[model samples]
Target: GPSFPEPKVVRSQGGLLSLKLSATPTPLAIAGQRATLLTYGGSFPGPTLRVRPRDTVRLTLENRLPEPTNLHWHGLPISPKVDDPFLEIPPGESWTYEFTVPKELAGTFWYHPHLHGRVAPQLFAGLLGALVVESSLDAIPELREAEEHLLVLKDLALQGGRPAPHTPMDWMNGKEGDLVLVNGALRPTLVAQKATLRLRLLNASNARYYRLALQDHPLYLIAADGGFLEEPLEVSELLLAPGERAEVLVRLRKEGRFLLQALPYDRGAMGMMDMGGMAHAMPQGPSRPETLLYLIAPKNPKPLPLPKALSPFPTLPAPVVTRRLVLTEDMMAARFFINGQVFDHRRVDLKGQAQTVEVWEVENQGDMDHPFHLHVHPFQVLSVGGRPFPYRAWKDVVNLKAGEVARLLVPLREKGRTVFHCHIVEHEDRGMMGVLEVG
Candidate 1:
């Protein structure tokens, strides 16, 4: 019944983004319920780190939790040593993540625990945050005038006001929470100060998919996971699988009240197949849509027009090679696999030369949706589900439905070893992961 706290903001000064982020047990009150959540810097969605391209980030994570923990900067094309999975921050210890923002990469990225099999649980405990890459695009006259907000979309199922440990079935099906949270609040309310509002959305859920659509508003999508697209699309609805990000602009246009809704989406979870048709209900997801954000509009209502164009899209070179990465799951045993192998840090599943272009055919052979995610470099989706991509944009996470194949134009930007796996951390931790070496 109370308003949730906002994320602590840290900015890059001069050329360096420096900060102390602690993952500690903290108490959070949502509505009338209270729970002790593991958070970063005392915030559920953690602190928002703001930086720009060419800035070096020295982020230190102090772990106060009683278990081992580590950090991962999702969707940044940086060195693996900086975003290392092998580096562990034991309880009461600390580690600094040192990496440089790629000169060409900019947009909405996020951070969360990435400690092998412990990822999903740690993230579920609230070890996550937003990383924003400020670009010249942010200085656009229209964009700068709009009030902006960063939304971390997460969900949780609580038992006695605390997160319940996942059962084998929960892990196998990729657990979905009964309560969906935006920036660590249930049905949080905010007031719009201007006619135009910008919402940078990050899907930090373990496996839930969000078809975000606002009531009585047209969303102008200007940027995606990696960066700004060449053109902005006026969309009524947008789908974000786990670990995906999007930036959209909405004009209140004399609106009195508007509710941002997570429209129902069927990822075909274990039992929702025929149930969706039987009662027109999403068994695992929202049976009926719920308001994610309550926006009270008191604005000028002039409806500032968007710019004619955004940023320049990169021209991808022809692929020099093709690699098929298939996703498979052994439902009976609760094991997942990528190309018949579980993840082994000692082994390299794929190799390529640095800065070279290749096509990766990511195929989902299972009976459910798996959001495929790769570390370091972002790729352009060339085709998915037997059709060409609607537009050219870079992203590190892409969703593949059952029996669907997505061809991605991947360019290995740096010389290092990193992993690619299902964004559903449970599937990743179970075995559906592989490492790639670029040198």
Candidate 2:
């Protein structure tokens, strides 16, 4: 029997977690495919860092790559100077970060390089990892008793079992790899030992959407990108675009093998990078359904009832201001845009007062789908595609289809300059990004 690939897990101690992570090129294997690939701390997905709320995280990043790079604390509400995209660590240099996790913020987050014009390539070589903030909900036995599994989903197109340089077409449409990976393993398998399971999923792919569903279980969604939901939203399938995270609960009623799959989802003809409306011809339909991973239920624990209520969701006040950020692409330049302008680090495009409530209408004016992501602060999704969103939860990332409009109720909680951009790394690197300054 084959075994699953396991990345190193680091946990906080005494409310202080100090560690060092180095990004270097190392010899490694992805599901037995050997290659010398760029890695973080000698691993494909790096080390998983876990910490409790209000804990202090002091870490250093050493860059051994040939070019410059820096890491961003995605979805964590830290200071811009510490977690923003403007900082860069040149080759053979190092940078250190120190921040305290806010007591109110506890959820699934991630870290990756934010180097402009180089994000897609660097991340494609594998320089990312998961950061999990232990939730207060962990105190509940009903939710914490289950066997927890962390799954980071990514896709890669390998040639002859080695990393290959992407083509021009791939950059234009945002590359979705032919191979799907779970925790750095290609189509892995796990021997399930517990009946009740908590699956925490993070979509780290540059431009792939995962419609996750279990073959024989009802998936109960307990959290989104920011944190715990008000209640379990029962659903047969959940869609997670790039940069999104979801926490789901399920139980094995009978002992048997269970398959987890990604159903077919067409995100607008694979989204051309231009608004010229020139349809790119693809002989195939939306990708066929593929099983991401499976569980062998040789042993099982008795089914336990999942709790209906998890946490309290705070409601923000009505917005005193309304802002519109338009997403478009420049066909000639082959770059994307937020408000028709390219990303300039020294420029501040939008400004607001700290702690003020505002409504930002994120509209997609292009012909393709773009997932929007904001750093530091999370927002409540008020509407999507012109329809009211039904649930109450905080999210740092939201998916937007072509010509779709999403209205977000966001509070200027953190005071500093940060960014909001398309989570599609290629699009953001090209130009689909904007800077926000609030104080």
Candidate 3:
């Protein structure tokens, strides 16, 4: 394996951020087998992209993988006339993404390859990153005396030596892992003192949804995908989809140690009613539950007061869009497609206006699970399990369990053609993708 280069960040005129991408192969081991870990700059969930509201950015992409590559800015608004229909960058080639940001919004965004028919193999090997858009750095007392950590979560194969392979149907029925990663390593331990810390959480797992909880203290969610929530949401557990982000304010009180764990909720096992039980020993299947990160606190506590109440924030209004989106999966064909078609790098699917909001109702007609994701735009979760998401937070990607239904309110502020498809690479390559156009 090679050393993953620090992400290249650039500042340009007209208030914009620029980025460069170089995909390569590194070694990964899973369950004792050794294989190549294909990734951007030899790392999975690549790098972090930090932006601000109303700032335009240019994305410069270079593909060096064994195949062609392209980028999909998962949640922002650029003009559809130029950005609508998505951009493609092939092997040994590059593409420049130029766009103006909308002043009214800010939050966490992301990027990844949108090449149909090969997303899983490429992304699984490593081809993802974080795109953060914020207003100003608010003074969080924790930064005065504690460290800030980026904990991007993913379920990857790092057990033995070799990782799992991408198959025609890995999206739904084929791939599962026992090891979970914080950032990109096994059971990461955050060594800190009994102090205040800023934790940025990104759920980057391909198919698994993370149900996270703290051991002794209450987990406070300060921000959602589109940015800060109306206020903090205190909870023992928070479920995160494949491409969602959250900023948590944690006042670690436990002195010695603790575990920051993701609760196992088996969506693909038997009935949704069955709680898969302890050890994640699928009462029916072979999946086992496990912990993700370990937290080690120092002796002397830092200076930071636990706030009784979180600050107030604004919420995005309901959208005015009119689109009916559906999902369908074919187990026998081993192909997962959106609107009944797999990804066609040469095809254009749907189009819309810039800065407008639209609602999409997704139906998981396939037996296997599919995590739906779109680029350059974040959607508000309208419903899950037939219940409205009370938080109504923004999300760049939505994980749909098998036969699950999702209603989303998507704001197409960035007027560019990005990608709207399943985040699972295998399903995407097999055709579970559709084009989204905003002008």
Candidate 4:
């Protein structure tokens, strides 16, 4: 293990957590090749930050990787008018983040780079982590001690032990890889306690969307992208997209052994960026998803059952205010863009005030796949070009399949200027990035 650096204290609210972002090679088998690669915090699927809704979030971002990286608080209501990036912190510099979590809307959230062009490699290299915000102050002892767990979901591709470097052309279709890692391991295990256990789940894959479930056990979905649901919804599995989060509760039966698997899905029929059509190349296929963690027999069990409901969510409808941004792959520039505009470090795209709702019509104008992201707000998928989006959840970042259109209801509830760029960083830096201003 490498000597860990002490995180600089930028803010102190008892809930403050310190994090250091660095890269080092980890050996793993990928596509039948034994290789090593650099990852965030020396591991893939980085560390999990557990927090309470009212506690202040104090974090420092140190760019120890080869390229520049910035932290984006996905799924949380963040300040939208603030332009505070730890730009090119380089290999030794650091940037401290000081923010207060709103008392409303709490659940599972995630952290990753908002920098464009480099998102693919940055994320593929393990620059991802989990953020769990408690919605209530209820003291459920079993969950407080024995069996609480956090899981970050991700996938990768390797050549020579490092991530096979990607080209701008790769984003034209979509970025996909082979191996899957949950909390940085193949099939890890979690020890459970008698009470209901809280699982903070994040879909950290670059392009893969997973359907997750536990064998024989039912998952009580306590919250979605925006926050806690009105009531708990019981389901066998839940669908998670890249850069999305879900807060779930699982009651363990005396803690024994069980397999926690990510259900498989059809990424093959996903459309390209141009509103063109689906691209089912070498990467898109029906395959088995990774096993995040195994549940171990718990030493303690909860004395009581789960609550009928955790918290109540506002019955809000998707935004009606709208704008259409097309994802286009330009062969001429050998790159891609949102609404045909690339990254301009000196410029910001849209401007608005805090606590506002706007609908974004994401239309893919090219033949590739693009994972679009928005900082400072969690948006609802209104519909795919006016078609009903049955599964509505709040998401900070979203993937727009090629030629396919999806509308998101973006709420600028936090004050600050935040960037909304391609989650695929390489595509972002090479002129695929855009900044949005919120006052």
Best by lDDT: 2
TM-scores for the candidates: 0.93, 0.93, 0.78, 0.74
Output the worst ten-in-a-row residue range by lDDT, candidate 4: 1-10
* Minimal lDDT window, size 10, model 1: 274-283
Model 3, span 174-218: residue lDDT tens: 354666666666665666643777677776666666777878887
Compared with the true structure, the alpha-carbon lDDT of candidate 3 equals: 0.64
Ranking by lDDT: 2, 1, 3, 4
- Please give the CA lDDT of all the candidate structures: 0.80, 0.81, 0.64, 0.62
Tens-digit lDDT string for candidate 2 (200-305): 8889888888888888788888888888888888897888888888888887877777788999888753433534443655422476889888787645458789
Candidate closer to the true structure by TM-score (higher is better), 3 or 4? 3
**Residue 125 in candidate 4, Cα distance off native in Å:** 2.7
* Residue 201 Cα positional deviation in candidate 1, in Å, after optimal superposition: 0.7
Query: CA shift at 225, candidate 3, in angstroms?
Result: 1.6
What is candidate 4's lDDT per residue for 91-192, written digit by digit as tens?
A: 657777777777765666666665544556666665666666654434644335434555666777766666778755555534676667665556655554
TM-score of 1: 0.93
Residue 418 shift from truth in candidate 4, angstroms: 2.9
